[PDB]
Structure formats: C-alpha cells, structure tokens
C-alpha cells in the first residue's frame, strides 16, 4: 500500500544521496505531512543546506514549522524560507493560520527564479518576490545537501511524511492541485527529479550516524472525500452555532417536533419533613406557567420533585452569586448581604470602624464583635458550645459556618444531572437576577455540578413568573439580547453586532441590537453604546432581555430553533423518547457519471456513530471502533500539607478555555491548591510537580493529547513538561521524554508498542505557572469496549419512488450510489437515521438534476449562488463544501483555484476598500488625501518621539485593545503619552492634545485619524473618546465632536458638516 | 534608458505618455520637494498640466552593493568601472588562500546582485605554531595541508595544565581548531600555581618561577628551605625557621599577644568595609570589577618578626552590602568582589528570570549590567 | 523621629473601603524603621491589602514615584518548608496579588508593592523605600 515515515523528536533524520542532482534555478517541493502538536520551535521538515564552509551560512531553502512571535512562541505556522548565494538576506514566508496538529497537510513550496510561493492544501497562502536568480552555482553543487526531518543543529520534526516529491521546475497551482488529486508516480516525466514512496528507504536516503532511521508505517492519508467537521463561528461555541446547521433548523419544520424534557425541582427539608423550601402551590403554579409558556414552542416539560431530608443543610443560607473569599475582602459586595452572611462580615455596614483592633475574648458571642475587624470575637461566635453554629458563625476559614455556596451544595447532594434538568434554590441579596445557569457547551451540563439556580423568594410570584423561562433559555443555549452591545469587552469586539446576523451578538437574525434596560419600550440616548445613539425595533418583549416579567412574553423563532437544536445536540439523555437524532445537513453530491451519481452525508447532529446503550461505553466510540475518552479522575499532591492529594475538578473534562494562551480558572496549576497565606513551595529539581490524571476505561492506547493552555513567557529552560509517565494496570510505569509544548495548539503524543492497558498518566513539570486544561486518550483501531456496541444505519429516500430492493437495504456506511436515474429527471434525496427499528427525522433534501450542474461539479454556476466551485469537498482550501468562498481568499479560475489575497504583494481593485495593507487608505475619486507634517504633541519624552505622525500611517501595524502597557513596538510607528501612564492619569485628571499641521491649507471634507490602539485598559470597561477640532488659517476652532475608538474603524472618518450659507 | 509611447499623436493640453524603463534600471519618480518611493510596475503614465510636466521621471542604473567580504570570502576587490549595471569587478584571493577557477571576475546584474563567482578562494590551514611544554598527538596535523574546522590535539606535560583547572580533575590535554582565517585556536600549557607555601614563612623566599610548577624556592640564611614541586603538586618538605601603620578603620585583636607564630584577628571599624591586600598598581577607588582581591582573615607573624599581611598594606575598602541573592541587581555589588551581586544582574542566573535594577534610573547596559562571564549572555 | 509634612500624601476615595484612608510617605526607610516610625507617629500599622480596589488605588497613588517599590505590611513568619505570610497588624491573609515566580524564589523576607503594575515582590527588609501606612 502507501507507506509513511514517522519522524520523532529524538533525532531521527535522513539525507539525500549524492547521485540525484539538486536543482539550481527553479524547484518545487511537494510533501504530504501530518504534524504533531508539540514541536521544537524552528522545526525543519525539509532543508537544502551547504556543508562547504561555515561562512555565510543558512543559505538555501528550508520548509518547516516555526512560530510567528519568536519571543513568545504563540502562533506556529508552516514556513518556507529561502536565501540564495547572491542575496544578502533570507526571506521567510508563512501560512495564514496556525497549523492543524493532527491532519494531513499537502505542503508545496515552489520557486521560479523570481517568485517564491507556498501552497497549503493546494491553496496559495504566501508569495514573495525578494529572492531573485538561481539558488547556487554549478561549481558549488557538490557540497549541497538535502536533509529530511532535521538540520545540522538537530531541528527535528515529529510527525508523518507520506509522499516526498522534488521537481526541477516550478509548477503552477493547477499542476499542484493535479498532483494532489493524482497521488501516483510522477517518474515518467523528465522534469521530476525525485518522487518518493517509502517502500525502500535505504535506496535514495541515508540516515545519519547518530540518529536512527525513522520507522515506516501504513498511513491511509486519503481516507475521506467529505470533511465531516464543521467549525462554529468566532462568537459561537458548538456545532449548533454554525450557520449552515442552524439554517436547516430554521427552514424545516420537521426538526421542531414536540419533545418531552424531564426536569427536577429539589426542595430542602429537615429531618422531620415538615418545612419545605418551596411550597407545593408555587411548585404547581410554576409548572403550569412553564407548560403554558413552552406549549407554543413545541417543548414539553415533565416535572419531578425530589425531597431531601437533611436538617444541617436546611439551616444554612445558600448563596447563589456570592463567593466565600469575598466575605473577608473589605470591598463591599451587594450579593453577600444577609443575616447569616453578617453583612459581608460588616464590610457593607458603615458602623464597622476602619481600624483593626483585636479585642479580648471573654464569654458569650457579641453581634458587634462578630465582624471582620473585630476578628469574629476571637472565634467565640463559631464555637458550638457558646451558641448555635448555623446562626452565629461568620468566619469563612472555619469548617462549619452559617452560609454555603451552591457549588458546595451540589457536591453534598450529588444529584445525577445527566437525566433531569436539576433546579436549585439559593438567596441573592442583590435580587436583580437569578443564579448562574450552566450553558449546554459547558463541561458540567451533564455532570452533577450543572443545573439552574433560582431564588425561592420570587418563585411562582405573579410579578416574577418569567424568571424560570429566562433561566431555562439560558440553559438551552440562548444568550441575552443585549449581548452584542452591553456584554462585550470593548468597542473593538468582533461579536458587537452592528447589524442582525447569525454570527454576531446573540446569534439570532430576528433580534435587533439593543442595550440593557428595564423599560418595556425603545430607549432613547445612551452613553453605554459606542457609536449607536438610538435603537429601533428593540426586542423589549423578549424573554432574554432585562425587561420586567409582565413585559417579557415572546420568543423569536430563531431562539426556538436554537433551543430545539441544543436539545437534539447535547440533551439526548433528558428526553424519554429514544428517537435518534437527524442528519442536520443535506446530503452532498460527491460526483456524477453518465449512468450514476454518488452521495455522501454528514453524521447525525448527536455526534454519535453507535447506538444508545445506557450501561456501556458506546457514546465514547468514534466512526471506527476506536475509543476517545477524557481524564475522569484527577489527583495532584497538595504542596504544603504532606500527602494532602487535592483533587482538581478542573482539568478533567473536555477542554473549555476561551483565550488559549492566557491564565484561566478552568485549568490546573501547581500553585493553585495552596491558601493565599501559605508560601507556595517550588517544585523539586529532578522530577517536578506532577498531575496524575486517571481515565475511566483502561485500554490499549495509541494517542494522548494534553491541552497545555498557559506556559511561562520568560522560560530559560528547554521543555516545560519534564516527562509524562503512563501508568499501566500491571504496575509498570512507561516513561516518555521531555515534551515540547505550544501555547495554542494541544500537545499530541503518538504511543508506540504500549501493549499493556493504561488507566492514567502522570504529567511532570518544572514550571510553576504551567496550566493543563484537559487530557484525552485515543485507543487503537479495535477496542473491546466498542465491539459490544452496534452502529447506526442510514436509509436513503428519494422523492421519486425508488426500487424496493434499493430502498430496503440499510447502509452501514455513509455512501450511496444508484444507477436508476433518467437523464432529464430531477430527484430530491434525503437520509433517515435508523438505530434499531425506530427512525429519525428526515434530513434536508438535496435537489439534483442529472443534466445540469451542482456544488461539486467543478464548474462555477452563479445561478445556484456558487461563488467558487472546486471538486474538493474539503474545508481546508479556499472553497467550502457549500461552494462559498472562505474568509480572505479569492478564487479565479473556472475550476476554482484560490489564493490568499489579504496579505499579498499586489493590490487589486476589489480589495482597495477592505485592505489597508496591500493598498493605501481608500480615497474616493472626487477626493484627495493629505497627511500631516511637523506635528506637535502635548507630552514629549526621549522614548516617545512625537514626530512619527508625519506622513503615511502605520498600515502594517495591527490595532491593539485591552492592553496594559503600550511599550512593545508601537513607539516607533505612532505616538502615545510616554510620561503619563494609565494609573497616574487615573489619579490626576489631565487632557492630552495632538496638534497636526499641513503643508497646503485646503478645505476639510473629512478628517482621517488612523489609530493602532483603542486606549482601553484591560481592567477598565469604559470606552475612550477622541475630540477633533479643525483649526483655520485665521486661528479659529471648529468642533467635530466626540467619537469612540474601535479597531474595526481603523481609519476613523470624521465627516465635516459645513453649512452652505 | 526607457521606452516612451504616447497613445495620442497630437500633443495638446491633456495628452499623456507612458514611459517604461528597460532592464537593469531603477525608477525615481519625484516631484518638487517630494521624494516618493519607486513604483513596482515598470510603466508610469505622465500627463502635462498647464504646459509643464507635473513630475520628474528618471531611471538610474541599479546600484549593486560594494562587494562585501560575505559575497566572496578571503578576497580583495578591485572594481575600476564602478558598481553600476553592466560593470565588472575583479577579486584576488588572500595570501593564505589559493585561487582556483577559470575566471575571477564578478558582474553586476539586472536584478541588483553580483553574478556567481567562477573562482573559489580555497583556504588551507598550514602547520600550527609550536607550544612550549606540549606535544602534538595527531600525525596528520604535522602536515601542511588540513581541513578547515577540524581539531588538533595537543597534550601538555604532567604538572602543566590549562589555568582554572580543578584539583580533583587535572586535565592535561587540549585541542585547537583551525579557524576560518588560516590561524588556530590559541592555547598555552601554563599552570598558575604548583602549591601555595604557608603564610608563616612568606616574604624571604626566592624561586625560579615563583609559585609555578617545578619552581625551586629557596630562603636565604639541620635541613634547609629548599623544596621541589612534584608531579602530584606537593612539595618534598616544608619551610622552617606594635603595628602602628594601620588603615583608617583597621583594628587588630591578638588572642595570644605578639608572640612568634601567633595569629591575630583583623577587622574594619566601619560595618560596610572589608580588609584586603591591595597591589601597588591598584588604587582604592579604581579597583577593577573583574578582579577578586584577597580578603584578610588573620595577621600571622613570620620568621623575620614581621607581618605577612602588613597592616599598612591592608586596605579597608567599601565592603559588599548584604543585598546578595535577593533577585535584585545592585550597582555597588556588580563585581567579582561581591560575586556580581550573587549573579542577580544577569537574566540567565537570577531566580525570577528578569533583571531588575533596584533604583528605577540606572544604566541597564552600563553600571547595572551583567558582567558575569559564566552567564549565557557573555 | 517623625517624618516631614511635605512628603506625606493622603489617599482616600476608594470604591471599596471608603472609610479607610491611607498615607503614602516618600521617606526612604527600611521595614522596621518605617514600621516603628508610623507606629509611634501615627496610630496604626502598615497597610494590609484585602481586596483588589485597594491595591489598584494604591498602585494609582504610587505610580508617580521615582522609586520602584513601596512598603506594605506583609511579612513571612515561619521556617521549614511551608511558611506563612501575615500582616503586621494581625489581620488574616486572604488576598494575594503576586508577580511572576515571586513567592517561591526566596529573596528577602519582607513584602513590597511594585509601582509599575501593582504586583507584589518579595524584598529585603533593610531596603530604604517609600512606605504606606494607615490610621
């Protein structure tokens, strides 16, 4: 078959034999490679080096993986770097995105003597024209060497190499796509210097003496003709947030069938079972109001009530939105204000004196001495012998106290939330909202820590009957309507919806943008909004807004589609009806012949490839019989207390960090278990601090990924992960080497010859700020736990009647071929999922005409809305499988070959308005632009020049926001006040002015202000405004107003409204 | 040096002419006091306004760089015709280099780079200069032809070693590399010290080489004070038989009085001062930051009824502040006398992995700099 | 031995703990010297930080100083392997706002606040730095 080399990081590398003559003028390197997640920083896949002499080194060309930011190692991309012998500098071109750490990538670097180009998956991602002429002279041809998978300085590579290919000519993009489609031998052509199959690795390649030869395995690179992974948008979180998946739910009414959802209301009782937290009257009234609200949206709620008789749990006060660490903090918090709280330990009470005097303790507890500054009467109030614990103890350091958090309540109750929507009750002193509702995409949505926390004081009240509908909408994946205006980081957030769309704001096209308000009407002027002074068609009547409960009475149909789609996606265990999930996307036409057509469809929206069995591991099994599981139990030693062994509830489930290179609370850290008062010990030198992650089902492993989120920026040592030791069930520890990690992409390890079953790993670290987000174990191709499960079946139903034998057969695989088509007839197809005897909802129908074109035909048809048309059905290129072009790609030819146009050298007319990098700032045909000269600023220093505003703007600089310190690289392009920092400007209020003069005094139709920073501090939520005054030749000021600063509006255009009289 | 074409034959107010230069020329499109960048496209269309030309279009020859040593190594360049397009230059190989190749001329080209050299200046390493008390161990290194970048091993005599060598690990062989310029790595088998004589008989000794290896020390006047340094580093025997000139803060306390061979404690009256032995060419305020002077612990009397560490010779200089090893760089302790403040002034050695001077206005590359030679920066 | 009147700066108006007022003194003194000085000239100990708004307002107040550090009330009281921080006035330690690799890099036994960034740094107790007190 087809064979692939596996290079590891230990130093396995090859070199080409001297008989093949290396190219000099033009070349093309084509290689199918499958990288791993953790790489050495300048990793080299293939390089052409010189061993003639160590003078004017790094000449030649090298393709590999390297980070864009060398001082941070954040963004690792494929690069191609060339330096010919006649040149004086080395030019490096990079791809447009971070490399995918587990997928096959067809890298192709070409050079024709004037242009060097890089193609990733057949789409051109970078080009350059700096390097000119041939690479090297024929006189120096003897000492040129071609290293594979390494270099002289052991810049090794971890991954698979399938089809190495070197050409003495620079092929066009069409020949690159042809060699991608046709993976056969190219040795018939005379221009092909070398193409490689790894049947005989000793023929044309010789390994190094120290580094052993890489092992040859079987690859199966071209496994799929349809990419079954659809990414969510930037503001979404799951497959349901995708536009093409939610469009089928919005269009088709067969998806929004009535569904029965089971939910549980939990009331706390004492041991006598006489005192309920919620009375049965308001429980029944809330159930009736809920079934009244959700009857018109085809959602049926089944009420269950569980009585918990615990006398100690009832006496406490359950705090919804408060934190036990905020009680001792002297900042007043509104939510922690109750009798059992102690008014935040007196911190919200003005009778608390600011001094700290520790009074003498004598006798009974005192209400005035129970505050924080009196040190809880010296601990007399928390003593059980003096008085009752449940009404007098306010010290959060004590093991027994008056108040209890709901996250501590759910650990005590340990309610199985996998089958019911658990409703919890807790008291909020601010009372403006309910408790925290867990989103469907959170890791706790099926665990015991997930549910809905409500306030029982307003439960089933005539003025407060709509809060449970709001929290149920939050638990079914609906955001607030004011998310796109009010719940954003700054005015430069990408999710700030200027217009209603499926990808911005609350991910609903029906709901217009709106701020947060308590009114039942349209608000007028508002300072919270950045640029929008007024709003119209505000959804005041929606359940998700901040209006009063009598005002909220309507759901948009898009929110209904989102709720039904999230009930199908993640909430299959709640519904008692075992109807399988539908295929959410229409079947796609892979290819057509003269007498047949081929159809392939996506997996169902549940994401499961096997039947539903409750007491087995059938939900862990993938398309094949592999098993993919996460770390069920975590154990790390407590650093201060010996043999403490604290259990991280984070770093267990699926990875759930938002910013992937930032310190987060959802990750395990070596110094997070300790108290603030104790000194955190450093990790030991020979081993380091370790995390022991245990998996639920021990099996034979083949892959192990670890989501290392945050690493230390100033890290002088080589590898953050010291080692990884797999724990076998036999007791043997199998140790791996120190693994290099990246911030963004997950670390991935391929495990060889691990015959014994592995139940867990131990990750050792010498870094005390390393954060591990999740671990994932992937088993071999045949797993004994997945052999018991039976797979789903698929049935293809056509709108013309099919044959009985063709319609009767249930397909195991997702491929369908029929020969019963007439040449002029039109056929609508769909696929129904059949698990056992029960069938699912129908998929959306694909309409196919046997003569006319379609999506994957290879010819662009503008009648069907196809902006691009390629036969790939692969989302990695510039053209989607839905035949719309991707972001910042342009496709030219009738068989659409696409190139990355946003950072290209040339400037074209269709990207003058969009791009500030390729072209200049866009000036219309009736206007002229003049830039400043000899400008003067308010604050001058030696570090900040102040004269950098003269002339053309810094178009290559990106716009930064939420930035603490502006001292990275922006001082050489733009002016900011050096002498005054943000805290010192906050302490003493000052006004900065920038006075820019112009050589030729003309009229001002508009003023263009180009900014590279919004000015937003990372701790302050306020927006920043700029005021512009035009100055005349008569020295008079004309005001142009206050304008907010957004990175979206990089060249701020301020229109001058001049009165014509 | 251009081709010009006008789409209109008649020249009137409004006509335009497109000029595109030939190969090997760089455009400089300019206006009146307006230096714009060069157009990437070859064709520029010029339109006359009010009977005058709005811009000046010129095409200079493309300036090849003056032929650097990084273009052809070990060569001297003579270019009489210049560095413009079409010019030629000659290169002559060095005296420790051989000129092999058909043509030794470099041509400036259209793209702006000099053409591929057809002659390769080949440098061959000759026989290395000899080293005293060392023997060459490689037989091919005695020849006059050698590869560039290889190592030739020279072994010292027993008792001769590289200075800075440890007592437990005395390494007696080193290697020198043929460098790029035809030279070699310098290495001398010079030992700093055989063994130090005891301080109780210091001052009257006269040696052949001082404290060096195989140095015969005699004291001018049973046995005598004549000893010979052995191969292991030891001697065959040992030597036998009121200070009013004090410093500004020097204090001596004698627990045994002024008897023969008694040891008295030395101290400085200032708390921030340390007592050292300064050399005659080394002053007080100009002590080098790389120098480690010998600190004084005790005064021990000699056989001539004198003091080995004479009190006048003892200088109480400004001692090290106790702020060492606190992840903080200080300008006072940034010297080998105070262990470069415990190595806190270098990024690779400080515990917090970031250099922070204690005053917020100090020279980071100057007085508060990293001067530790063991650090990875040096 | 009480400090001068020109060097003392009064800071008040924090959104959390608006009753407690702080005084920043630019008198460069050590930890023990400034601690006993503001113990004997004022009627309170050094500042004990318990939340973030106090730390942010203190950083805003001391960001204009030419010295890089100011004194707070933290002190390490313990020996062995697991030591404990504590404040000088005996209040509990619940808020920790440290810099990168700060509490596990040894160094001095006292706690200071950096004027650039506001994070806490372990420093030697014999350093002459400005100090913040309260009464």
Author numbering:
A (entry chain C): 13 to 1073
B (entry chain D): 1142 to 1362, 1371 to 1390, 1400 to 1536
C (entry chain B): 88 to 222
The authors write:
Originally discovered in the circulation of pregnant women as a protein secreted by placental trophoblasts, the metalloprotease pregnancy-associated plasma protein A (PAPP-A) is also widely expressed by many other tissues. It cleaves insulin-like growth factor-binding proteins (IGFBPs) to increase the bioavailability of IGFs and plays essential roles in multiple growth-promoting processes. While the vast majority of the circulatory PAPP-A in pregnancy is proteolytically inactive due to covalent inhibition by proform of eosinophil major basic protein (proMBP), the activity of PAPP-A can also be covalently inhibited by another less characterized modulator, stanniocalcin-2 (STC2). Here we present two cryo-EM structures of endogenous purified PAPP-A in complex with either proMBP or STC2. Both modulators form 2:2 heterotetramer with PAPP-A and establish extensive interactions with multiple domains of PAPP-A that are distal to the catalytic cleft.
To assess the molecular mechanism(s) subserving PAPP-A activity and the modulation of proMBP, we purified endogenous PAPP-A·proMBP complex from pregnant human plasma and determined its cryo-EM structure. The presence of full-length proMBP was confirmed by western blotting using a proMBP-specific antibody and non-reduced gels showed a major heterotetrameric form for PAPP-A·proMBP. The cryo-EM analysis generated an initial dimeric 3D map at 3.64 Å resolution, and C2-symmetry expansion was subsequently applied to obtain a final 3.45-Å monomeric half map, which enabled de novo modeling of most of the PAPP-A residues. The dimer cryo-EM map contains two copies of the full-length mature PAPP-A and two copies of proMBP, exhibiting an overall butterfly-shaped structure with a dimension of 230 Å × 110 Å × 90 Å. As shown in our structure, proMBP itself is a monomer. In the PAPP-A·proMBP complex, the binding of proMBP induces a nearly 30° rotation of the βBD towards the PD, generating an interface between the βBD and the C-terminal subdomain of PD. As a result, the relative orientation of the LGD, PD, and SD remains unchanged in the two complexes, forming a rigid core of PAPP-A; but the βBD, CCP, and CTD have drastic translational and rotational differences and thus constitute a movable region. The comparison of the two structures identified a twist motion for PAPP-A conformation similar to a “butterfly wing-flap”. Although the highly intrinsic flexibility at the interface between the two PAPP-A subunits results in a less resolvable density here, we still found that the dimeric interfaces contain not only the previously characterized intermolecular disulfide bond but also a strong hydrophobic pocket between the two βBD. While proMBP formed a 2:2 tetramer with WT PAPP-A (lane 4), it could only partially form a 1:1 dimer with C1130S variant (lane 5).
